[PDB]
């Protein structure tokens, strides 16, 4: 939850798209 | 052990000072500013044996009084008073104030405010007749002619109160505007009949009086201060470190 | 610190730079009030009361900044200009054309460049109608808008103008109060109630000059001299922020 | 886990760095006219609240979240451009250019203060341990 | 706080002001019975700065 | 106990949190006290620690007083 | 109490 | 398999 904890799940892929799909 | 505070205290008395000048500057374009001064007061310990610690303390001994630029603007409700002449309004807390500002406007109901604030006439907050044309004479007259009717009709209505204070018997509040000080409440009486000697220009306006070449004086000095006192900081913190890790 | 101070005092200045390139850009606009910027500083801080007192009064009392509070415009009567068309009439005076807006609602306005649509009817240049309204006739060799605001239209193989209406001017106690809806309108605001519809030249109202535009009232230069006033105090705060700046800097580097 | 010194300061040079990546991005952004979707660019506000841990004690600094600015967008007349309105005004991003310079050298100078704070402590940390051996 | 430059300003604002009148004057020279206006100007407070 | 000092007005009344007139209050925290105090009290904390080494070595020596 | 020590673990546990 | 680093992978491009 808070940003630097510990969890056992990657995190989602960070996409940035220029266009609405 | 103890200069470091000595120092601290100086560059902290050093950035309120730039604080002050800061906000002086900032009101540059402010209709009728008195700029606030500012002198280093120093303050010395006492005690034993040898006095040697002597402390800085940041004050801003009252304001200036010197006139700034008129600025003429072609409205008649533009007024500029005479050197070390105020005008009176009623303060935000039902009390009474002076100012430089001469932008006075008029209500839809007809009041005369400056900064909102209700202007105070002879007696009591002044009040024009709903939408008419208004003239301020030079010493405090006013002149109302309704719109659209012989101008053989224009007619006196009141009179605004024009106070004479210098510096020392003013100081101001933290709402903006300027009262008397104690002492000065205590031999002119809690409120200021008014001035019949002060003339007043109408279709100018009064600006502020912040001198730009003292700030820019004021600024460098700060900074020069500020860095000789970390100086000394540096200087006190390298000392004790070695002195208690070696002597220990 | 100083550093909201100076941002302040910057911020100040790029307002009134807004409003002196709208007051420039708004010189040919016909019937155009200039724009004038006033600032106040806000609320003082206190840090210690001065002493019971020769020396010098000792306290800290230290500002805040500058606010913009209020941009007022300058009601004064500008100039004439000849345009031969017949639809244009300048106010001499304090008045304002009353116009209904697409909504329904009432606006106010002075530039007097008019014309007619499909179906007769006086409009604004942006084609909202002009109330009273005005219907004329397809025959109309000539209209004449009197200075009393009288509508008269000239027929075809007749020897009398045809009276048609009155242009009702709306009058304000404070003009000054008016809120600027945008394209040369003004709407009514509680500083500027109670609008007082009237017949030109009555109860205070402007007559009508017919085939006259009214100018902008911008002066040109003291916007000149505004501008440059406000570039050095720009740099002015600038140079208190560069100062702030390198003082924390050297306390963080000690 | 870290030390409590070690957060607070952790926390704080955490806080300002997303500080000075929001500034970047809305300096970055300040001409921007659409977004991915067709809405105009917002100025995004970071807001600093005390992780105050025990009762009202001491705490770092901790972001809730990064919200967006309500400001009049600004409007600039291009009836040609199709995200032009019915009266058409383009709407341009609220970004302040000074505010958001102030900004970044007031996460700067908070950035370096919490390092200096951190590297002053470091000694005394490393000094603590010889208390034993 | 720049002074000379309001000071300037009035100069450019009176000189301004005889120019509309010097225009006027010239524009009605065939209007019957029209009669020239001169404007008269005069300047404004003087501060008066402490000689001890 | 809570610092007396005004609390530091700021004129933002864009924030969502604000004052009647816009008068955002930020904390009082003088930054150079708040730096001469963490140094100083470094100081101090080290000398402690100095005192506390030749405490114990002194006992260890007394430990050893006849042997 | 109140307050915890700089060199202590997190209060945050 | 991680990629460039730095500038080119911190740019916005459509994928391919």
């Not at chain 2, 100012?99 to 932008?103: F, L, V």
């Not at chain 2, 003339?199 to 306006?205: A, D, F, K, N, Q």
């Not at chain 5, 430059?5 to 450019?12: C, F, H, Q, S, Y």
């Given at each position: 939850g ?13 996409e ?6 | 052990?103890?200069?470091?505070y000595?120092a601290?205290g100086?560059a ?5 000072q730039?604080?002050?000048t800061?906000?002086?500057?900032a009101?540059?374009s402010?209709?009728?500013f008195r700029?606030?001064?500012?002198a280093?007061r120093?303050?010395?310990v ?9 402390l800085?303390?940041?004050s801003?001994?009252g304001?200036?009084?010197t ?7 072609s409205?008649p409700?533009?007024?500029a ?6 005008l ?10 002076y ?5 006075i406007q008029?209500?839809?109901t ?9 202007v105070?006439?002879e007696?009591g907050?002044?009040?024009?007749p709903?939408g008419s ?5 030079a ?9 659209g009717?012989?101008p053989?009709?224009?007619?006196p ?6 106070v004479?204070?210098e510096?020392?018997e ?6 903006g505007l300027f ?7 205590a ?11 002060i ?14 070449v003292?700030?820019?004086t004021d ?22 470190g ?6 220990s | 610190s100083?550093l909201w101070i ?8 790029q ?11 708004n010189?040919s606009?016909?019937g155009?009030?200039?724009?004038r910027?006033?600032?106040e500083?806000?609320?003082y ?5 001065p ?5 010098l009064?000792?306290?800290l009392?230290?500002?805040?900044g500058?606010?913009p509070?209020?941009?007022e ?6 100039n004439l200009?000849?345009?031969?068309n017949?639809?244009?009439?300048a ?6 054309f ?6 329904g ?23 909202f109608?002009?109330?009273?309204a ?12 009197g200075?009393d605001?009288v509508?008269?239209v000239?027929?075809?193989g ?24 945008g394209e040369?309108?003004?709407?009514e605001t ?7 519809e ?12 017919q ?7 911008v002066?040109?230069?003291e916007?000149?001299?505004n501008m440059?006033?406000v570039?050095?105090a ?5 140079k ?5 700046d ?6 963080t580097?000690? | 886990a870290?030390?409590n010194?070690?957060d607070?300061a952790?926390?704080?040079?955490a ?6 990546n929001?500034?970047?991005s809305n300096?970055?952004?300040a001409?921007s006219?659409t ?17 105050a841990?025990?009762?009202?004690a001491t ?7 990064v ?18 309105d ?5 709407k ?7 505010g958001?310079?102030?900004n ?6 908070s950035?370096?203060?919490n390092i200096?704070?951190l590297?002053?402590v ?6 603590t341990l010889t208390?034993?051996? | 706080?720049?002074?000379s ?8 604002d009176?000189q301004?002001?005889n120019?509309d009148?010097?225009?006027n004057?010239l524009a ?6 029209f ?6 100007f005069?300047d404004?407070l003087?501060?008066?700065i402490r000689?001890?």
């Open positions: 808070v940003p630097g904890a510990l969890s056992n799940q990657p995190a989602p892929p960070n940035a798209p220029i266009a609405t799909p | 052990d103890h200069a470091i000595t601290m100086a902290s008395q050093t950035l309120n730039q604080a002050v800061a906000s002086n500057l009101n540059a402010t209709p009728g700029a606030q001064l500012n280093l120093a303050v010395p006492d005690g034993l044996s040898l006095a040697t610690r002597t800085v303390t940041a801003t001994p304001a200036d009084m006139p700034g630029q008129l600025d003429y603007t409205r409700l533009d007024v008073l005479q050197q070390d002449g105020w009176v309004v009623q303060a935000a807390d039902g009390a009474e104030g100012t430089r500002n001469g932008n008029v209500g839809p007809g009041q005369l405010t400056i900064q909102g604030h209700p105070i006439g007696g907050p002044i009040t024009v709903e044309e208004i003239t301020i004479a010493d405090g007259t006013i002149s109302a002619l309704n719109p009717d012989p053989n009709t224009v007619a209505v009141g009179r605004l109160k024009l004479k204070a510096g020392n003013v100081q101001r509040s933290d709402d009262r008397l000080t104690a002492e000065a409440q031999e002119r009486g809690a409120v200021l009949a008014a001035d019949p000697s003339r007043i220009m109408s279709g100018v306006l009064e600006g502020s009086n912040v001198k730009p003292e700030a820019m600024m460098i000095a700060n900074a020069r201060r500020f860095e000789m006192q970390m100086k000394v900081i540096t200087s006190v913190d390298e000392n004790e070695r002195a208690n890790q070696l002597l | 100083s100076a941002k302040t005092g910057l911020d100040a200045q307002t009134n730079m807004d409003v002196i390139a709208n007051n420039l850009a010189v606009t016909n155009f009030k200039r724009q910027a006033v600032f500083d806000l609320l801080q206190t840090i210690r009361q002493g019971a007192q020769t020396t009064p000792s306290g009392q230290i500002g805040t500058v606010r509070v209020a941009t415009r300058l009601h004064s009567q500008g200009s000849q345009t031969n017949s639809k244009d009439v106010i001499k005076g304090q008045g304002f009353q116009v209904m807006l697409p909504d609602t009432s606006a106010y306005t002075r530039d007097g460049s008019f014309q007619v649509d499909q179906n007769g009817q006086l409009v604004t240049a942006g084609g109608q002009v109330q009273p005005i219907t004329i006739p397809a025959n109309a060799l000539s209209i004449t808008i200075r605001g509508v008269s000239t027929q075809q007749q020897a009398a103008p045809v009276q048609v209406g009155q242009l009702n001017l709306t009058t304000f106690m404070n003009d000054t109060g008016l809120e600027s809806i040369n309108l003004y709407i509680q500083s500027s109630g109670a609008p007082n009237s017949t030109p030249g009555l109860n205070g109202a402007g007559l009508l000059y085939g006259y535009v009214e100018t902008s009232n002066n040109v230069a916007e000149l001299v440059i006033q570039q050095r720009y740099e002015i705060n600038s208190a922020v560069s100062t702030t390198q003082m924390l800097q050297k306390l580097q000690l | 870290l030390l010194i070690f607070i952790g926390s704080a040079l806080a300002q760095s997303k500080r000075l929001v500034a970047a300096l970055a952004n001409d006219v977004g991915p979707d067709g809405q105009p660019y917002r100025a995004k506000q970071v807001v600093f609240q005390v992780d841990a025990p009762g009202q705490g770092g600094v901790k972001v809730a979240s919200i967006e600015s309500q400001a009049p967008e600004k409007l600039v007349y291009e009836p040609g451009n199709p995200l032009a019915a009266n058409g005004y383009v341009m991003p609220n970004v302040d250019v000074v958001e310079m102030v970044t050298m007031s996460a700067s100078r950035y370096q203060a200096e704070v590297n002053t470091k000694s005394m940390m490393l000094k208390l034993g051996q | 706080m720049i002074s430059l309001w000071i300037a300003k009035t100069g450019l009176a301004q002001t120019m009148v010097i225009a004057n009605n020279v065939s209007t019957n019975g009669k020239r206006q001169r404007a008269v005069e404004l003087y501060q008066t000689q001890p």
